[PDB]
Symmetry: C2
């Protein structure tokens, strides 16, 4: 039926490069590690992404990922200008640009992380890829 | 390989009742529609769920779902005591207790919703079920 197309999508996950499914660098919404949490709130309000990569000087040097929801732990009274994105930043999980989607889903589940940073052949940033991107190859588009 | 177990999990999704995969009512974290957004912030801080069902008088009368992230649109200056959970509540998607997981994933994708409210045979609430619960039948546990 339509069960059939998902069967083929699973056997083909070991043959799909993560570069074929990622969100490329020029479409990433990211933030500097020295930005305040108030700037993360503003960034969230504009773009509505739950997970934001964090970089030092360029989007080509990701140093981690920040969750917009972690802002909810902080009191507007003083904390938001008083802390930087680095204070809430989780360590990044990098995957090569030619890693297959099958291996990525295995490691995303094991590592208990939802977003991976995809690096290019030369040491910079090619983009990001999330569990939803991997899911949409199996299921369709969400 | 291990590709094999996911093949069986997909053909069996049409034979798995949503009651077999849901989170049951007594383990739901929910909030009253007349609670302030400050109480939703407190509820989020304690339990960390992103989506919370919303009820009138009992958890057996769900009237919608609230997103913790929608609190980030509101200014601590006055809004949080000044609004109620009802002001941010999205309409609920109810599914019967014997609906198959296959049909649920089809409708969750089409409807562009992540959480469904599972109703019991007698008109009350049996629990909730999310796209992740459906995903974990295919993939494992996340
Ligand atoms: N920071 C980001 N910048 C640009 N694109 C992103 C970012 N985060 C995710 N995406 C892309 O948006 C799509 C949706 O991803 P995902 O649902 O994981 O993010 P989200 O909707 O912010 O998270 P969640 O659904 O858990 O709230 C994916 O294709 C992903 O590649
Ligand atoms: N409000 C809730 N109360 C109790 N259990 C819930 C609630 N929301 C989700 N769950 C359960 O927790 C598990 C994780 O679900 P899910 O990842 O969709 O929620 P979440 O982690 O809060 O959302 P997100 O990952 O998008 O931030 C699922 O098994 C789901 O049934
Ligand atoms: Mg998508
Ligand atoms: Mg989404
Ligand atoms: Mg889970
Ligand atoms: Mg989760």
């Amino acid at each position: 039926p339509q069960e059939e197309e998902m069967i083929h999508s699973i056997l083909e996950l070991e043959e799909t490069p993560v570069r074929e499914i990622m969100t490329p660098r020029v479409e990433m919404v990211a933030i500097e590690d020295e930005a305040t949490l108030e700037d993360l709130l503003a960034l969230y309000r504009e773009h509505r992404y739950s997970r934001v990569p964090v970089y030092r000087e360029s989007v080509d040097h990701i140093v981690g990922v920040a969750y917009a929801k972690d802002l909810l732990d902080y009191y507007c009274e003083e904390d938001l200008k008083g802390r930087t994105v680095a204070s809430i930043t989780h360590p990044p999980y990098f995957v090569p640009e030619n890693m297959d989607a099958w291996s990525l889903l295995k490691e995303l589940r094991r590592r208990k992380v939802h977003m991976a940073i995809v690096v290019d052949e030369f040491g910079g940033t090619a983009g990001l890829v999330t569990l939803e991107d991997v899911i949409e190859e199996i299921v369709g588009e969400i």
